[PDB]
Design a protein around this ligand. Structure first.
Ligand code: NRK
Length: 309
């Protein structure tokens, strides 16, 4: 019945470019799944790629796979049909997992930046242990799961031809705004500022400093320059892809914009593009790894050769 009502709605409100959205979501799904699985496989199969940065990259790819499997189809269905179709339990699950994984990814990138800063900029050049990396990953996951509990709490399937949509139901008109201010500060603003500061210091230390005399330090500097360039490009892509969705969420929840405007077409186009951009970044990270890491490129080629021959 709900599907029939969608057919009535989509007929009376015909959208021009649903097919390009479907094609883009399918391409993003396939590319993200393949690339993140290949990243995990490449790091886990070989030991020369087993670095703390690569452990954090593996955690990021695991979160990306979780989002791609559990959250991408639901987001596509909601953006196409504007209805939920999945039920109260799946609704309390899927946005919760999506927000948890977004926090996990941003704080994993922050952990990478902090470890690189400790190794490069700190006067002691700390070398992190695998125990510390695994503990950091575990605490990131636990904190992300804890802080997103109210997000899963406020998800409700409203039933307001009409449609059934799962959205955020709050008691007051102030609590959502404070919660979303905190959400924006935790997921996008503060981690991005800290990572920008850390990578600016790293860039000064690696590209604005004299070349040492010891050959081992020279090789270390070259390797760290390549890795830091890859990390900075990954951070820039992440910031670009997550800027629109975070800004739109702030404008809709905190400032209460897009409410009294009857121009839902442009607003919905921007919202669905921002939704697509998150999964697009999830798909683009492995491509960045392939095009900026020689070891990752070689291991992707090796995995392709094994799977195809
Ligand atoms: C359709 C759809 N609606 C809202 C969406 O994002 C809205 C939210 C969000 C804000 C800022 C950054 C984020 F990263 C995610 C609040 C999260 C949610 O409610 N997440 C959520 C909701 C439904 C869903 F299927 C999956 N995730 C998405 C991304 N897709």
């Amino acid at each position: 019945e709900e599907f029939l009502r969608y057919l009535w709605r989509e007929y009376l409100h015909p959208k021009e470019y649903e097919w390009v959205l479907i094609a883009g979501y399918i391409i993003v799904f396939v590319v993200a799944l393949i690339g993140n699985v290949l990243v995990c496989v490449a790091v886990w199969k070989n030991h020369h790629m087993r670095t703390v940065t690569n452990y954090f990259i593996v955690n990021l790819s695991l979160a990306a796979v979780l989002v791609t499997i559990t959250c991408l189809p639901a987001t596509l269905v909601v953006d196409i049909t504007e209805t939920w179709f999945f039920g109260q339990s799946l609704c309390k699950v899927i946005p919760y997992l999506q927000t948890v994984s977004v926090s996990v990814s941003v704080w994993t990138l922050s952990a990478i930046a902090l470890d690189r800063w400790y190794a490069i900029c700190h006067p002691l050049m700390f070398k992190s242990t695998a125990k510390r990396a695994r503990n950091s990953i575990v605490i990131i996951w636990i904190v992300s799961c804890i802080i997103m509990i109210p997000q899963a709490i406020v998800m409700e399937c409203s039933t307001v031809t009409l449609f059934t949509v799962c959205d955020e139901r709050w008691g007051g008109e102030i609590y959502p705004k404070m919660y979303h201010i905190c959400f924006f500060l935790v997921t996008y603003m503060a981690p991005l500022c800290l990572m920008v500061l850390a990578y600016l210091q790293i860039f000064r230390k690696l590209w604005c400093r004299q070349i040492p005399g010891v050959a081992a330090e020279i090789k270390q500097i070259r390797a760290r320059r390549k890795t830091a360039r890859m990390l900075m490009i990954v951070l820039l892509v992440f910031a670009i892809c997550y800027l629109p969705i975070s800004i739109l969420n702030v404008l809709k929840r905190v400032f209460g914009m897009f409410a009294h405007t009857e121009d839902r077409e442009t607003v919905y186009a921007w919202f669905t593009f921002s939704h697509w951009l998150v999964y697009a970044n999830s798909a683009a990270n492995p491509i960045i790894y392939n095009f900026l890491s020689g070891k990752f490129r070689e291991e992707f080629k090796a995995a392709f050769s094994c799977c195809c021959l």
